[PDB]
Design a protein around this nucleic acid. Structure first.
Ligand code: MG
Length: 182
DNA sequence: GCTAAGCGCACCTAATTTCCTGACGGCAATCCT
């Protein structure tokens, strides 16, 4: 009962859990997919979390009506790598003077532009509520690890990314004209 | 019943020209709104 992680204002539109993830096929303009079917099998909690982290980074266009993420169409992502998590964090540490207001706080105040890095790296273009049914699953058949009762669907809306916001992702790659490099 | 040796060439020259095309025609869907 309170604030929730990567969740936002009240919702009405309901979409299946298959579209939060991208690697598994979703409800396209078809009926058959790569042997998946919506509202039958769902993802685990870890898969749901790793799909929620895909939202600020790898959200594409939804047919030119649904807007993209904060860093446009998802560009090339480049970073510095090491054999350890300590070297993982240390080699990509370069911070900026203004941090920003990340989305794991509540409803952030828009105020002026030039968010920084911490507000821009965690921008939420979608929402999640999910309606919990009475009990749930018995054996998992979508993730692969046989788990307890899992999710079935969710609820996704969009937020229009405004104009301006002169901002550069630290790991993104941007062309000569400032557009995203694909 | 049916033979056997020896002998078998090389030199000359072998060519010059000029011409050799142009224009036209080259496709679209449908594989995320
Ligand atoms: Mg899984």
């Amino acid at each position: 009962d309170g604030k929730r992680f990567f969740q936002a204002d009240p919702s009405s539109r309901i979409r299946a859990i298959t579209d939060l993830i991208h690697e598994i096929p979703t409800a396209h303009n078809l009926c058959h997919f790569k042997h998946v079917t919506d509202y039958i099998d769902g993802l685990c909690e870890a898969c749901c979390i790793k799909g929620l982290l895909r939202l600020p980074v790898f959200t594409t266009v939804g047919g030119r009506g649904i807007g993209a993420g904060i860093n446009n169409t998802p560009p090339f992502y480049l970073l510095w790598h090491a054999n350890d998590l300590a070297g993982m964090l240390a080699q990509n540490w370069q911070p900026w003077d203004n941090m920003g207001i990340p989305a794991w706080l509540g409803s952030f105040q828009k105020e002026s532009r030039e968010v920084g890095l911490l507000a821009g790296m965690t921008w939420l273009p979608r929402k999640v509520y999910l309606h919990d049914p009475v009990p749930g699953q018995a054996a998992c058949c979508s993730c692969g690890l046989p788990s307890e009762a899992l999710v079935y669907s969710c609820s996704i809306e969009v937020e229009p990314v405004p104009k301006g916001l002169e901002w550069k992702d630290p790991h993104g790659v941007y062309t000569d004209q400032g557009k995203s490099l694909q």
